[PDB]
Amino acid sequence: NLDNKLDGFYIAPAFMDKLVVHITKNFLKLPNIKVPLILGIWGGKGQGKSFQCELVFRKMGINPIMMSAGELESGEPAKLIRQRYREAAEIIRKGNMCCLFINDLDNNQMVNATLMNIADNPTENARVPIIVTGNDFSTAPLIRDGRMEKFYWAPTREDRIGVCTGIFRTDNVPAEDVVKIVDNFPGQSIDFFGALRARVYDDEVRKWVSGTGIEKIGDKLLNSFDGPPTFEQPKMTIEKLLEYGNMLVQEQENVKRVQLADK
C-alpha cells in the first residue's frame, strides 16, 4: 500500500512491507506480542536482494551499519558484531532510525551464539533491529525457534519489471518496452539487464574506436585541448534491446558449453 518508487527505482512492495514493518516494529512497545529482533532474508535470487534493502533503507533515511560476510570470517567474528551493533545503537541512541544490516552468507558456532546472547536482551543499552541476508539460513534454527524471522522473498513478474525499469530510467524507455524484454528473457538475473544496457554503450565506443583511428586514440582521448570526445547517451530502443539480449544469451549459453566441455 505504501509508496515503493524511489529516484526512478522500483521497490518490491512485498519486500518493503516486510522490512519497513520489521523495523518500525522493533521501535514500538506493542502489547502481548514477542517481536523478533532479527529478520533474515533469503531467496530473491537474481533480483537485487541486498539492493532492495539499500533501497528500503534510503527510503526511511537509515544509514545502516553495514557488515560483510568476508569481514565476519577474518577476535573479529564475535567482537565486530557487538561493536557494529553498538555503533548502530549509539546512532539510534543519539536519534534518527538505524539498524544493523549484516549481509550475505554461504566460527559459525560463535556467530550464531553471539546472535543468541544478543537476542536475549539489549545489554546503558539500546534496541536495534538486525537485518541479515543469505542463501538459506541453515543451522538460525535455535533463534528461528526463539527470536528471529526467516523471510523467503519470492519476487513477482511485477517485481522483475519494476527492478528492470530501474535499470533503464535514465534512457526514457516505454513501460511497454521494459515489459517486452523482461517477458522475452525469463529466468535472467538483474545482472543480465545491466549487462545488456552496458553492451549498448560498449558497442558505441567500439564504433568510435574503430572509426576514429585505433592508433590515434590516446591523443584524441587525452593530449587534446577539447578534452575526451564527450559521448551522447545511446537511445535504448526495443529492437536494439532484443537483438542485444539474444546476443548475450547465445554468448552465455556458449560459455556454459565451453565450460562443461573443457571440464
PDB file of C-alpha atoms in Angstrom:
ATOM      1  CA  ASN A   1       0.000   0.000   0.000  1.00  0.00           C
ATOM      2  CA  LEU A   2       2.965   2.325   0.770  1.00  0.00           C
ATOM      3  CA  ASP A   3       4.896   4.200  -1.975  1.00  0.00           C
ATOM      4  CA  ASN A   4       7.624   1.969  -3.427  1.00  0.00           C
ATOM      5  CA  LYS A   5       9.200   4.039  -6.212  1.00  0.00           C
ATOM      6  CA  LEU A   6      12.419   5.923  -5.402  1.00  0.00           C
ATOM      7  CA  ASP A   7      14.663   8.092  -7.594  1.00  0.00           C
ATOM      8  CA  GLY A   8      13.458   6.230 -10.720  1.00  0.00           C
ATOM      9  CA  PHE A   9      13.964   2.962  -8.868  1.00  0.00           C
ATOM     10  CA  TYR A  10      11.324   0.431  -8.006  1.00  0.00           C
ATOM     11  CA  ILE A  11      10.955  -1.472  -4.730  1.00  0.00           C
ATOM     12  CA  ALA A  12       9.105  -4.782  -4.403  1.00  0.00           C
ATOM     13  CA  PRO A  13       6.174  -3.710  -2.189  1.00  0.00           C
ATOM     14  CA  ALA A  14       6.069  -7.153  -0.531  1.00  0.00           C
ATOM     15  CA  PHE A  15       9.780  -6.729   0.296  1.00  0.00           C
ATOM     16  CA  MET A  16       9.192  -3.198   1.525  1.00  0.00           C
ATOM     17  CA  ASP A  17       6.240  -4.033   3.899  1.00  0.00           C
ATOM     18  CA  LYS A  18       8.277  -6.838   5.331  1.00  0.00           C
ATOM     19  CA  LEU A  19      11.337  -4.732   6.063  1.00  0.00           C
ATOM     20  CA  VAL A  20       9.719  -1.395   6.878  1.00  0.00           C
ATOM     21  CA  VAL A  21       7.346  -3.107   9.339  1.00  0.00           C
ATOM     22  CA  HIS A  22      10.077  -5.363  10.710  1.00  0.00           C
ATOM     23  CA  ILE A  23      11.972  -2.259  11.512  1.00  0.00           C
ATOM     24  CA  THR A  24       9.315   0.117  12.856  1.00  0.00           C
ATOM     25  CA  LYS A  25       8.046  -2.821  14.939  1.00  0.00           C
ATOM     26  CA  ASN A  26      11.305  -3.000  16.947  1.00  0.00           C
ATOM     27  CA  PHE A  27      10.927   0.667  17.891  1.00  0.00           C
ATOM     28  CA  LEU A  28       7.499   0.240  19.399  1.00  0.00           C
ATOM     29  CA  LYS A  29       6.338  -1.280  22.654  1.00  0.00           C
ATOM     30  CA  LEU A  30       3.269  -3.067  21.387  1.00  0.00           C
ATOM     31  CA  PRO A  31       1.192  -5.252  23.694  1.00  0.00           C
ATOM     32  CA  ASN A  32       1.364  -9.011  24.106  1.00  0.00           C
ATOM     33  CA  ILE A  33       3.445  -9.892  21.117  1.00  0.00           C
ATOM     34  CA  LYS A  34       7.026 -11.015  21.139  1.00  0.00           C
ATOM     35  CA  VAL A  35       8.704  -9.035  18.346  1.00  0.00           C
ATOM     36  CA  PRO A  36      11.588 -10.743  16.578  1.00  0.00           C
ATOM     37  CA  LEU A  37      14.724  -8.607  16.691  1.00  0.00           C
ATOM     38  CA  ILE A  38      16.415 -10.034  13.635  1.00  0.00           C
ATOM     39  CA  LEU A  39      14.863 -10.558  10.198  1.00  0.00           C
ATOM     40  CA  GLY A  40      16.749 -12.968   7.957  1.00  0.00           C
ATOM     41  CA  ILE A  41      16.094 -12.521   4.237  1.00  0.00           C
ATOM     42  CA  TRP A  42      16.623 -15.349   1.728  1.00  0.00           C
ATOM     43  CA  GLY A  43      15.653 -16.234  -1.846  1.00  0.00           C
ATOM     44  CA  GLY A  44      15.080 -13.481  -4.455  1.00  0.00           C
ATOM     45  CA  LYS A  45      17.994 -14.911  -6.458  1.00  0.00           C
ATOM     46  CA  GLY A  46      18.982 -12.779  -9.456  1.00  0.00           C
ATOM     47  CA  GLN A  47      16.943  -9.955  -8.024  1.00  0.00           C
ATOM     48  CA  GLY A  48      18.874  -7.360  -6.074  1.00  0.00           C
ATOM     49  CA  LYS A  49      18.019  -8.619  -2.600  1.00  0.00           C
ATOM     50  CA  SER A  50      20.798  -6.584  -0.974  1.00  0.00           C
ATOM     51  CA  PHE A  51      19.917  -3.744  -3.333  1.00  0.00           C
ATOM     52  CA  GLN A  52      16.299  -3.910  -2.264  1.00  0.00           C
ATOM     53  CA  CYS A  53      17.491  -3.475   1.321  1.00  0.00           C
ATOM     54  CA  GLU A  54      19.585  -0.418   0.455  1.00  0.00           C
ATOM     55  CA  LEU A  55      16.521   0.947  -1.418  1.00  0.00           C
ATOM     56  CA  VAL A  56      14.272   0.474   1.573  1.00  0.00           C
ATOM     57  CA  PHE A  57      16.873   1.930   3.974  1.00  0.00           C
ATOM     58  CA  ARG A  58      17.332   5.078   1.894  1.00  0.00           C
ATOM     59  CA  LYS A  59      13.560   5.431   1.675  1.00  0.00           C
ATOM     60  CA  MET A  60      13.481   5.849   5.502  1.00  0.00           C
ATOM     61  CA  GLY A  61      16.798   7.638   5.681  1.00  0.00           C
ATOM     62  CA  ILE A  62      18.561   4.864   7.518  1.00  0.00           C
ATOM     63  CA  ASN A  63      22.319   4.705   7.101  1.00  0.00           C
ATOM     64  CA  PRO A  64      22.528   1.153   8.233  1.00  0.00           C
ATOM     65  CA  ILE A  65      25.606  -0.130   9.921  1.00  0.00           C
ATOM     66  CA  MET A  66      26.867  -2.417   7.186  1.00  0.00           C
ATOM     67  CA  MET A  67      28.913  -5.557   7.594  1.00  0.00           C
ATOM     68  CA  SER A  68      30.317  -8.050   5.110  1.00  0.00           C
ATOM     69  CA  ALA A  69      30.477 -11.831   5.446  1.00  0.00           C
ATOM     70  CA  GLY A  70      34.176 -11.776   4.405  1.00  0.00           C
ATOM     71  CA  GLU A  71      34.654  -9.431   7.366  1.00  0.00           C
ATOM     72  CA  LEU A  72      32.949 -11.900   9.782  1.00  0.00           C
ATOM     73  CA  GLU A  73      35.404 -14.555   8.587  1.00  0.00           C
ATOM     74  CA  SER A  74      38.620 -12.571   9.267  1.00  0.00           C
ATOM     75  CA  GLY A  75      38.726 -11.891  17.579  1.00  0.00           C
ATOM     76  CA  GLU A  76      36.888 -10.327  14.618  1.00  0.00           C
ATOM     77  CA  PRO A  77      33.870 -12.734  14.307  1.00  0.00           C
ATOM     78  CA  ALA A  78      32.384 -12.246  17.815  1.00  0.00           C
ATOM     79  CA  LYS A  79      33.667  -8.758  18.712  1.00  0.00           C
ATOM     80  CA  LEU A  80      32.894  -6.909  15.444  1.00  0.00           C
ATOM     81  CA  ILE A  81      29.203  -7.824  15.808  1.00  0.00           C
ATOM     82  CA  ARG A  82      28.899  -6.420  19.320  1.00  0.00           C
ATOM     83  CA  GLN A  83      30.804  -3.282  18.179  1.00  0.00           C
ATOM     84  CA  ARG A  84      28.831  -2.874  14.907  1.00  0.00           C
ATOM     85  CA  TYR A  85      25.632  -3.321  16.951  1.00  0.00           C
ATOM     86  CA  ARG A  86      26.779  -0.722  19.490  1.00  0.00           C
ATOM     87  CA  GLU A  87      27.769   1.643  16.715  1.00  0.00           C
ATOM     88  CA  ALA A  88      24.234   1.483  15.222  1.00  0.00           C
ATOM     89  CA  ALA A  89      22.720   1.616  18.696  1.00  0.00           C
ATOM     90  CA  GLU A  90      24.639   4.809  19.536  1.00  0.00           C
ATOM     91  CA  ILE A  91      23.304   6.280  16.290  1.00  0.00           C
ATOM     92  CA  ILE A  92      19.746   5.304  17.260  1.00  0.00           C
ATOM     93  CA  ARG A  93      20.558   6.338  20.872  1.00  0.00           C
ATOM     94  CA  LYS A  94      21.555   9.813  19.743  1.00  0.00           C
ATOM     95  CA  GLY A  95      18.443   9.817  17.497  1.00  0.00           C
ATOM     96  CA  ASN A  96      17.072   9.074  13.987  1.00  0.00           C
ATOM     97  CA  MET A  97      16.334   5.491  12.971  1.00  0.00           C
ATOM     98  CA  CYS A  98      19.181   2.998  12.482  1.00  0.00           C
ATOM     99  CA  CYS A  99      19.616  -0.748  12.093  1.00  0.00           C
ATOM    100  CA  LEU A 100      22.451  -3.253  11.939  1.00  0.00           C
ATOM    101  CA  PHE A 101      22.426  -4.618   8.377  1.00  0.00           C
ATOM    102  CA  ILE A 102      24.509  -7.785   8.264  1.00  0.00           C
ATOM    103  CA  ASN A 103      24.959  -9.037   4.689  1.00  0.00           C
ATOM    104  CA  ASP A 104      25.470 -12.399   2.871  1.00  0.00           C
ATOM    105  CA  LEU A 105      26.426 -15.953   3.966  1.00  0.00           C
ATOM    106  CA  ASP A 106      27.462 -19.174   2.069  1.00  0.00           C
ATOM    107  CA  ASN A 107      33.434 -19.557  13.711  1.00  0.00           C
ATOM    108  CA  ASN A 108      29.790 -20.164  12.763  1.00  0.00           C
ATOM    109  CA  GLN A 109      29.043 -21.864  16.086  1.00  0.00           C
ATOM    110  CA  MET A 110      30.081 -18.494  17.577  1.00  0.00           C
ATOM    111  CA  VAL A 111      28.495 -16.104  15.023  1.00  0.00           C
ATOM    112  CA  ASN A 112      25.234 -17.870  15.916  1.00  0.00           C
ATOM    113  CA  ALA A 113      25.978 -17.837  19.677  1.00  0.00           C
ATOM    114  CA  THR A 114      26.715 -14.089  19.715  1.00  0.00           C
ATOM    115  CA  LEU A 115      23.355 -13.621  18.000  1.00  0.00           C
ATOM    116  CA  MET A 116      21.634 -15.754  20.667  1.00  0.00           C
ATOM    117  CA  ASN A 117      23.097 -13.816  23.630  1.00  0.00           C
ATOM    118  CA  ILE A 118      22.406 -10.516  21.875  1.00  0.00           C
ATOM    119  CA  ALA A 119      18.824 -11.592  21.064  1.00  0.00           C
ATOM    120  CA  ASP A 120      18.160 -12.257  24.751  1.00  0.00           C
ATOM    121  CA  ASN A 121      18.331  -8.532  25.607  1.00  0.00           C
ATOM    122  CA  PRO A 122      19.895  -5.175  24.628  1.00  0.00           C
ATOM    123  CA  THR A 123      22.939  -5.038  27.052  1.00  0.00           C
ATOM    124  CA  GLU A 124      23.468   1.607  29.341  1.00  0.00           C
ATOM    125  CA  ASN A 125      21.996  -0.417  26.359  1.00  0.00           C
ATOM    126  CA  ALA A 126      19.760   0.013  23.228  1.00  0.00           C
ATOM    127  CA  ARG A 127      17.165  -1.682  20.952  1.00  0.00           C
ATOM    128  CA  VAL A 128      18.486  -2.300  17.406  1.00  0.00           C
ATOM    129  CA  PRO A 129      16.742  -4.327  14.667  1.00  0.00           C
ATOM    130  CA  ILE A 130      19.161  -6.644  12.897  1.00  0.00           C
ATOM    131  CA  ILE A 131      18.618  -7.426   9.232  1.00  0.00           C
ATOM    132  CA  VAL A 132      20.500 -10.346   7.635  1.00  0.00           C
ATOM    133  CA  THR A 133      20.829 -11.737   4.090  1.00  0.00           C
ATOM    134  CA  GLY A 134      21.999 -15.151   2.857  1.00  0.00           C
ATOM    135  CA  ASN A 135      21.011 -18.061   0.614  1.00  0.00           C
ATOM    136  CA  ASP A 136      19.268 -20.394   3.066  1.00  0.00           C
ATOM    137  CA  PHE A 137      19.631 -19.838   6.813  1.00  0.00           C
ATOM    138  CA  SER A 138      20.986 -23.240   7.862  1.00  0.00           C
ATOM    139  CA  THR A 139      21.871 -24.230  11.444  1.00  0.00           C
ATOM    140  CA  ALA A 140      19.271 -19.751  12.711  1.00  0.00           C
ATOM    141  CA  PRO A 141      17.298 -22.944  13.908  1.00  0.00           C
ATOM    142  CA  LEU A 142      17.586 -22.135  17.670  1.00  0.00           C
ATOM    143  CA  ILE A 143      16.870 -18.383  17.099  1.00  0.00           C
ATOM    144  CA  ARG A 144      14.191 -19.062  14.479  1.00  0.00           C
ATOM    145  CA  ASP A 145      12.516 -21.230  17.141  1.00  0.00           C
ATOM    146  CA  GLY A 146      13.444 -18.438  19.613  1.00  0.00           C
ATOM    147  CA  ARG A 147      13.553 -14.858  18.321  1.00  0.00           C
ATOM    148  CA  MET A 148      14.210 -14.383  14.575  1.00  0.00           C
ATOM    149  CA  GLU A 149      12.168 -14.364  11.334  1.00  0.00           C
ATOM    150  CA  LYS A 150      13.073 -16.175   8.098  1.00  0.00           C
ATOM    151  CA  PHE A 151      11.674 -14.435   5.030  1.00  0.00           C
ATOM    152  CA  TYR A 152      11.740 -16.013   1.659  1.00  0.00           C
ATOM    153  CA  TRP A 153      11.389 -13.316  -0.962  1.00  0.00           C
ATOM    154  CA  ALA A 154       9.534 -14.687  -3.950  1.00  0.00           C
ATOM    155  CA  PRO A 155       9.721 -11.816  -6.439  1.00  0.00           C
ATOM    156  CA  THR A 156       6.742 -11.432  -8.838  1.00  0.00           C
ATOM    157  CA  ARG A 157       6.972 -10.828 -12.541  1.00  0.00           C
ATOM    158  CA  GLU A 158       5.792  -7.375 -11.403  1.00  0.00           C
ATOM    159  CA  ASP A 159       8.883  -7.073  -9.182  1.00  0.00           C
ATOM    160  CA  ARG A 160      11.173  -8.026 -12.100  1.00  0.00           C
ATOM    161  CA  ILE A 161       9.627  -5.437 -14.439  1.00  0.00           C
ATOM    162  CA  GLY A 162       9.974  -2.925 -11.618  1.00  0.00           C
ATOM    163  CA  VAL A 163      13.587  -3.699 -10.907  1.00  0.00           C
ATOM    164  CA  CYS A 164      14.119  -3.663 -14.630  1.00  0.00           C
ATOM    165  CA  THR A 165      12.507  -0.247 -15.148  1.00  0.00           C
ATOM    166  CA  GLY A 166      15.020   0.886 -12.543  1.00  0.00           C
ATOM    167  CA  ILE A 167      17.940  -0.113 -14.734  1.00  0.00           C
ATOM    168  CA  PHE A 168      16.606   1.949 -17.671  1.00  0.00           C
ATOM    169  CA  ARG A 169      15.140   5.087 -16.032  1.00  0.00           C
ATOM    170  CA  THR A 170      17.891   7.172 -17.442  1.00  0.00           C
ATOM    171  CA  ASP A 171      17.048   6.339 -21.052  1.00  0.00           C
ATOM    172  CA  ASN A 172      13.387   7.191 -21.098  1.00  0.00           C
ATOM    173  CA  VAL A 173      12.104   3.799 -22.219  1.00  0.00           C
ATOM    174  CA  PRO A 174       8.395   2.936 -22.607  1.00  0.00           C
ATOM    175  CA  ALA A 175       6.914   0.858 -19.757  1.00  0.00           C
ATOM    176  CA  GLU A 176       5.854  -1.233 -22.763  1.00  0.00           C
ATOM    177  CA  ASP A 177       9.468  -1.780 -23.862  1.00  0.00           C
ATOM    178  CA  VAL A 178      10.521  -2.907 -20.388  1.00  0.00           C
ATOM    179  CA  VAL A 179       7.624  -5.380 -20.288  1.00  0.00           C
ATOM    180  CA  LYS A 180       8.538  -6.928 -23.673  1.00  0.00           C
ATOM    181  CA  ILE A 181      12.176  -7.695 -22.825  1.00  0.00           C
ATOM    182  CA  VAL A 182      11.602  -8.993 -19.320  1.00  0.00           C
ATOM    183  CA  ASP A 183       8.996 -11.265 -20.810  1.00  0.00           C
ATOM    184  CA  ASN A 184      11.320 -12.071 -23.631  1.00  0.00           C
ATOM    185  CA  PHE A 185      14.148 -13.082 -21.276  1.00  0.00           C
ATOM    186  CA  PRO A 186      12.761 -15.185 -18.445  1.00  0.00           C
ATOM    187  CA  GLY A 187      14.894 -16.607 -15.629  1.00  0.00           C
ATOM    188  CA  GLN A 188      17.645 -13.991 -16.239  1.00  0.00           C
ATOM    189  CA  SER A 189      19.099 -12.007 -13.362  1.00  0.00           C
ATOM    190  CA  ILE A 190      19.066  -8.284 -12.918  1.00  0.00           C
ATOM    191  CA  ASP A 191      22.758  -8.602 -13.752  1.00  0.00           C
ATOM    192  CA  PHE A 192      21.599  -9.777 -17.182  1.00  0.00           C
ATOM    193  CA  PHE A 193      19.821  -6.465 -17.872  1.00  0.00           C
ATOM    194  CA  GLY A 194      22.595  -4.278 -16.502  1.00  0.00           C
ATOM    195  CA  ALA A 195      24.950  -6.196 -18.841  1.00  0.00           C
ATOM    196  CA  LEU A 196      22.512  -5.703 -21.679  1.00  0.00           C
ATOM    197  CA  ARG A 197      22.311  -1.940 -21.217  1.00  0.00           C
ATOM    198  CA  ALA A 198      26.128  -1.785 -20.822  1.00  0.00           C
ATOM    199  CA  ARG A 199      26.525  -3.770 -24.047  1.00  0.00           C
ATOM    200  CA  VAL A 200      24.862  -0.971 -25.994  1.00  0.00           C
ATOM    201  CA  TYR A 201      27.187   1.675 -24.673  1.00  0.00           C
ATOM    202  CA  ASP A 202      30.116  -0.695 -25.329  1.00  0.00           C
ATOM    203  CA  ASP A 203      29.206  -1.066 -28.991  1.00  0.00           C
ATOM    204  CA  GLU A 204      29.060   2.714 -29.488  1.00  0.00           C
ATOM    205  CA  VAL A 205      32.621   3.126 -28.075  1.00  0.00           C
ATOM    206  CA  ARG A 206      33.740   0.179 -30.301  1.00  0.00           C
ATOM    207  CA  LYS A 207      32.367   2.115 -33.292  1.00  0.00           C
ATOM    208  CA  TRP A 208      34.120   5.269 -32.126  1.00  0.00           C
ATOM    209  CA  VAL A 209      37.422   3.417 -31.587  1.00  0.00           C
ATOM    210  CA  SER A 210      37.276   1.500 -34.898  1.00  0.00           C
ATOM    211  CA  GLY A 211      36.100   4.664 -36.619  1.00  0.00           C
ATOM    212  CA  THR A 212      38.471   7.280 -35.250  1.00  0.00           C
ATOM    213  CA  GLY A 213      41.832   5.528 -35.504  1.00  0.00           C
ATOM    214  CA  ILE A 214      42.909   2.795 -33.132  1.00  0.00           C
ATOM    215  CA  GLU A 215      46.484   4.179 -33.490  1.00  0.00           C
ATOM    216  CA  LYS A 216      45.480   7.850 -32.807  1.00  0.00           C
ATOM    217  CA  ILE A 217      43.127   7.326 -29.807  1.00  0.00           C
ATOM    218  CA  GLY A 218      45.147   8.006 -26.623  1.00  0.00           C
ATOM    219  CA  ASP A 219      45.687  11.514 -28.006  1.00  0.00           C
ATOM    220  CA  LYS A 220      42.091  12.340 -29.009  1.00  0.00           C
ATOM    221  CA  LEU A 221      41.322  10.894 -25.624  1.00  0.00           C
ATOM    222  CA  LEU A 222      43.997  12.638 -23.578  1.00  0.00           C
ATOM    223  CA  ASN A 223      46.548  15.047 -25.111  1.00  0.00           C
ATOM    224  CA  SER A 224      43.791  17.025 -26.785  1.00  0.00           C
ATOM    225  CA  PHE A 225      42.663  20.504 -25.694  1.00  0.00           C
ATOM    226  CA  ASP A 226      38.912  19.882 -26.282  1.00  0.00           C
ATOM    227  CA  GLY A 227      39.014  17.033 -23.745  1.00  0.00           C
ATOM    228  CA  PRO A 228      37.848  13.444 -24.255  1.00  0.00           C
ATOM    229  CA  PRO A 229      35.172  13.473 -27.000  1.00  0.00           C
ATOM    230  CA  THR A 230      32.106  13.611 -24.680  1.00  0.00           C
ATOM    231  CA  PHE A 231      29.657  10.870 -25.724  1.00  0.00           C
ATOM    232  CA  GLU A 232      25.876  11.130 -26.326  1.00  0.00           C
ATOM    233  CA  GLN A 233      23.799   8.540 -24.467  1.00  0.00           C
ATOM    234  CA  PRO A 234      22.538   5.936 -26.984  1.00  0.00           C
ATOM    235  CA  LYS A 235      18.766   5.647 -27.432  1.00  0.00           C
ATOM    236  CA  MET A 236      17.765   2.312 -25.860  1.00  0.00           C
ATOM    237  CA  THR A 237      15.271   1.233 -28.499  1.00  0.00           C
ATOM    238  CA  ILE A 238      13.357  -2.031 -28.239  1.00  0.00           C
ATOM    239  CA  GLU A 239      14.743  -3.822 -31.347  1.00  0.00           C
ATOM    240  CA  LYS A 240      18.215  -2.781 -30.205  1.00  0.00           C
ATOM    241  CA  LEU A 241      17.426  -4.309 -26.822  1.00  0.00           C
ATOM    242  CA  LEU A 242      16.131  -7.636 -28.147  1.00  0.00           C
ATOM    243  CA  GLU A 243      18.954  -8.069 -30.616  1.00  0.00           C
ATOM    244  CA  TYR A 244      21.432  -7.415 -27.788  1.00  0.00           C
ATOM    245  CA  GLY A 245      19.555  -9.655 -25.379  1.00  0.00           C
ATOM    246  CA  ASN A 246      19.695 -12.759 -27.577  1.00  0.00           C
ATOM    247  CA  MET A 247      23.267 -11.970 -28.442  1.00  0.00           C
ATOM    248  CA  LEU A 248      24.124 -12.027 -24.747  1.00  0.00           C
ATOM    249  CA  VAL A 249      22.133 -15.223 -24.207  1.00  0.00           C
ATOM    250  CA  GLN A 250      23.807 -17.007 -27.094  1.00  0.00           C
ATOM    251  CA  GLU A 251      27.091 -15.906 -25.544  1.00  0.00           C
ATOM    252  CA  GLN A 252      26.002 -17.110 -22.095  1.00  0.00           C
ATOM    253  CA  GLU A 253      24.787 -20.446 -23.476  1.00  0.00           C
ATOM    254  CA  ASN A 254      28.118 -20.676 -25.209  1.00  0.00           C
ATOM    255  CA  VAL A 255      30.331 -20.132 -22.149  1.00  0.00           C
ATOM    256  CA  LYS A 256      28.310 -22.874 -20.424  1.00  0.00           C
ATOM    257  CA  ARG A 257      29.234 -25.069 -23.413  1.00  0.00           C
ATOM    258  CA  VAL A 258      32.966 -24.269 -23.434  1.00  0.00           C
ATOM    259  CA  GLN A 259      32.926 -24.552 -19.578  1.00  0.00           C
ATOM    260  CA  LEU A 260      31.359 -28.033 -19.257  1.00  0.00           C
ATOM    261  CA  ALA A 261      33.177 -29.345 -22.354  1.00  0.00           C
ATOM    262  CA  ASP A 262      36.584 -28.134 -21.086  1.00  0.00           C
ATOM    263  CA  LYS A 263      35.594 -29.733 -17.754  1.00  0.00           C
TER     264      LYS A 263
END
